[PDB]
A paper describes a structure:
In this study, we reported the isolation of potent and broadly neutralizing mAbs from a vaccinated donor with a special five-dose [name]-19 vaccination schedule. One mAb, named [name]-570, displayed the most potent neutralizing activity against all [name]-[name]-2 strains prior to BA.5 variant, and another three mAbs, named [name]-4, [name]-5, and [name]-535 were found to broadly neutralize all sarbecoviruses tested, including all the current [name]-[name]-2 variants, [name]-[name], Pangolin-GD, RaTG13, WIV-1, and SHC014. Cryo-EM analysis demonstrates that these antibodies have diverse neutralization mechanisms, such as disassembling spike trimers, or binding to RBM or SD1 to affect ACE2 binding.
We also determined the structures of [name]-535 complexed with the stabilized prefusion ectodomain of Omicron XBB S (6 P) and [name]-[name] S (2 P). As a contrast, two states of [name]-[name] S–[name]-535 were observed: 3 up-RBDs with 3 [name]-535 Fabs (3.05 Å), and RBD monomer with [name]-535 Fabs (3.54 Å). Fc region of [name]-535 is not visible due to its flexibility. The binding epitope of [name]-535 is similar to the class IV antibody AB-3467, which is located in the hidden surface and around residues such as Y369, F377, K378, Y380, P384, etc. Both of them can effectively neutralize [name]-[name]-2 and [name]-[name] through their light chains, which block the ACE2–RBD interaction by introducing steric hindrance.
Residue numbers in the entry:
A (entry chain C): 390 to 686
B (entry chain G): 2 to 218
C (entry chain F): 1 to 212
Write the structure that this text describes.
């Protein structure tokens, strides 16, 4: 699961080049197969790592097809791969018959001549076709060891082995919202309590065989969904011949979430010419929206 | 989906001045934000852009100088210009790129309005009056002169008596001189009878020093 | 990087429906090439997608084709409200995000004879130490004529600035204003100032001069 977190952060790379895939939109694609190619170049010689660019470090050491479709990186290591008394540790091939093929590696070590010529070290002009770099400390910008990491992205006919990261949402608590905790779908109010779950227990149900709570798959293992407000709304009418004002009688509610739903237009039986002036809450309240709680008898 | 620009540029090369790019009702949490430089006849080279993650890219030429910052809830993107040079004065835009399947390309369809950071310092325009009316050519056709110089900005217009006849004439866009100032050459076509008739008053205004001036040429 | 080039000369518009707007590059790309459009005066906008993802906003008449390394912009019958500079951007290299050069599509018009007029500097201008000779060139369609400055039978160049206006919607002509900036001493030293105009619609170069 390629997260691509170390590539965006720590902006210290010299050349962050992407050819086929977008440099920004990478947390959503599902690549078929990825590969890594690591090598150390000498300073400004990193100019032939693009499709079409030819030269001496493009057909003798590492080749590249016309359609690479991937990103490449390069970070400076002058303070690591450089000494003050000789850093002869990296070499490159610059003499070979023809050009290399896409994704080809050759570790041969033998003098080359396209006329036979076994090339005993002195024959007339025979020499080793491998020159060493000039890595030192007191040099210029164009003579510094650069480690180029080539990320070969592929989209061949294969299942989605490598994909982007899966960003989780925020934890909206104390509100009747939809929840999806890795398969557990539905709608409820996320509120904590004083229960004690076991380390191996992932989710928990109630006595009515209904999902009660579950640890957050993300982090901060706490309780989970509580049921929302519901019931049978009744109408209190003192008689059509007497008056024409009524009052809602929401069966079993706290008279606090219903007011928020009405003020935010969230309740299903939302009348168009209805308002709210006062809310009373008792045992089996039936919030009397439009009535006064007088202390008489 | 529409973006509105704000601010501008007045400081000298070597100071700090940030910009801003607003947003609209579109969900600005998964798309990207780019910047476009229009120098009115030059190249538009910019790659610096930030996304939802910690992606912080910069241009190869101007690297480590200009910082980028975006805010999802505020729906605003800022761009501070530190260590400003003399060859970066141009028009800055704000677009949004996106790919259809996942990564085909960048849309850059929705553009903005544009913002300029004119560095250095403004100048107060000067108008050369007493244009030659008839000294060598009396008959035929001629034109007057309301050439203006010594001004950094050009938010001006040349009206001819707010419209009196039906001839058809327009002004000329100014060009940047070697010293660092602009120059405009306003002309007007003469009617069949212009000698001893209604004159033309060049209504030059909108001076940075807030000093109006009018004179017949 | 991906060196992308466009047409060297802007192609005008006429009653036809065939243009030569190209977006050739150095390397080869399958479909990683978009197309934009910038109207002079306002901000640019997306015109043609990668030949297979045409979105809304742009009419269906504006088509797009491309394959291999030679890209062409097949446009239908042009409209007077669909003119401007068409740009294109490559999608094969993320760091070097560069746009096109510019392919303006102005409207064909009868080659018009440039109104050759010259205006000497005012007397009050010499009191400040400067002198500017203005030569007016109006009412001409071909935007290819360059102004030649000759002072005392000597060719002068480098100290002249020209200003070209946009194509008007009334007569479809252009207007050019060339100003020769000279010092006070160099102005008082010379007496003859001629403005040579070489235009395609003129059988002979019209040169206007005056005496100081």
């Amino acid at each position: 699961v390629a997260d691509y977190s170390v590539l965006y952060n720590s902006t210290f790379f010299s050349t962050f080049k992407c050819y086929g895939v977008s440099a920004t939109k990478l947390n959503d694609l599902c690549f078929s197969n990825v590969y890594a190619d690591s090598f150390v170049v000498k300073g400004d010689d990193v100019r032939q790592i693009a499709p079409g660019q030819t030269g001496v470090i493009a057909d003798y050491n590492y080749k590249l097809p016309d359609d690479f479709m991937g990103c490449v990186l390069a970070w400076n290591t002058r303070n690591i791969d450089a000494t003050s008394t000789g850093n002869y540790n990296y070499k490159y091939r610059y003499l070979r018959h023809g050009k290399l093929r896409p994704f080809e590696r050759d570790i041969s070590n033998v003098p080359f001549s396209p006329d036979g010529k076994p090339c005993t070290p002195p024959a007339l002009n025979c020499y080793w076709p491998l020159n060493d770099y000039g890595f030192y400390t007191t040099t210029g910008i164009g003579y510094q060891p650069y480690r180029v990491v080539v990320l070969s992205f592929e989209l061949l006919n294969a299942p989605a082995t490598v994909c982007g990261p899966k960003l989780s949402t925020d934890l909206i608590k104390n509100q009747c919202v939809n929840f999806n905790f890795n398969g557990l779908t539905g709608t409820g109010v996320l509120t904590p309590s004083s229960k004690r779950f076991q380390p191996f227990q992932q989710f928990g149900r109630d006595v009515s065989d209904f999902t009660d709570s579950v640890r957050d798959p993300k982090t901060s293992e706490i309780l989970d969904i509580s049921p929302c407000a519901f019931g049978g709304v009744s109408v209190i009418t003192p008689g059509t011949n007497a008056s024409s004002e009524v009052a809602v009688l929401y069966q079993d509610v706290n008279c606090t979430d219903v007011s928020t739903a009405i003020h935010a237009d969230q309740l299903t039986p939302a009348w168009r010419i209805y308002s709210t002036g006062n809310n009373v809450f008792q045992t089996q309240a039936g919030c009397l929206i439009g009535a006064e709680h007088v202390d008489t008898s | 989906v529409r973006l509105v620009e704000s601010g501008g540029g007045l400081v000298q090369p070597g100071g700090s001045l940030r910009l801003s790019c607003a947003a609209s009702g579109f969900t600005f949490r998964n798309y990207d934000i780019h910047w476009v430089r229009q120098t009115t006849g030059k190249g538009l080279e910019w790659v610096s852009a930030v996304g939802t993650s910690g992606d912080t890219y910069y241009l190869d030429s101007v690297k480590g100088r200009f910082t980028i910052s975006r805010e999802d809830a505020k729906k605003s993107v800022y761009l501070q210009m530190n260590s400003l040079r003399a060859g970066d004065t141009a028009m800055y835009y704000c677009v949004r790129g996106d790919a259809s399947p996942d990564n085909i390309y960048y849309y850059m369809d929705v553009w903005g309005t544009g913002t300029r950071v004119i560095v250095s310092s403004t100048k107060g325009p000067s108008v050369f009056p007493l244009a030659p009316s008839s000294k060598s050519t009396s008959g035929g056709t001629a034109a007057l002169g309301c050439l203006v110089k010594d001004y950094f900005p050009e938010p001006v217009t040349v009206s001819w008596n707010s419209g009196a006849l039906t001839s058809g004439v327009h002004t000329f866009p100014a060009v940047l001189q070697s010293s660092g100032l602009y120059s405009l050459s306003s002309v007007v076509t003469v009617p069949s009878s212009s000698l001893g008739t209604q004159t033309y008053i060049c209504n030059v205004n909108h001076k940075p020093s807030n000093t109006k001036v009018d004179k017949k040429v | 990087d991906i060196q992308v080039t466009q047409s060297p000369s802007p192609l005008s518009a006429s009653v036809g429906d065939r243009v030569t707007i190209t977006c050739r590059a150095s390397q080869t790309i399958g479909k990683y090439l978009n197309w934009y459009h910038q109207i002079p005066g306002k901000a640019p906008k997306l015109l043609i997608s990668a030949a297979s993802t045409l979105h809304s906003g742009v009419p269906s008449r504006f088509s797009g084709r491309g394959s291999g390394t030679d890209f062409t912009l097949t446009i239908s019958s042009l409209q007077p409200e669909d003119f401007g500079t068409y740009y294109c951007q490559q999608s094969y290299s993320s760091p070097p995000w560069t746009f096109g050069q510019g392919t303006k599509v102005e409207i064909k018009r009868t080659v018009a004879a440039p109104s050759v007029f010259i205006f000497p500097p005012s007397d009050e201008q010499l009191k400040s130490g400067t002198a500017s000779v203005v030569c007016l060139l109006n009412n001409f369609y071909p935007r290819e004529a360059k102004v030649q400055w000759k002072v005392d039978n000597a060719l002068q160049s480098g100290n002249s600035q020209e200003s070209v206006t946009e194509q008007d919607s009334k007569d479809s002509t252009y207007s050019l204003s060339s100003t020769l900036t000279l010092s006070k001493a160099d102005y008082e030293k010379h007496k003859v100032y001629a403005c040579e105009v070489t235009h395609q619609g003129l059988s002979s170069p019209v040169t206007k001069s005056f005496n100081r």
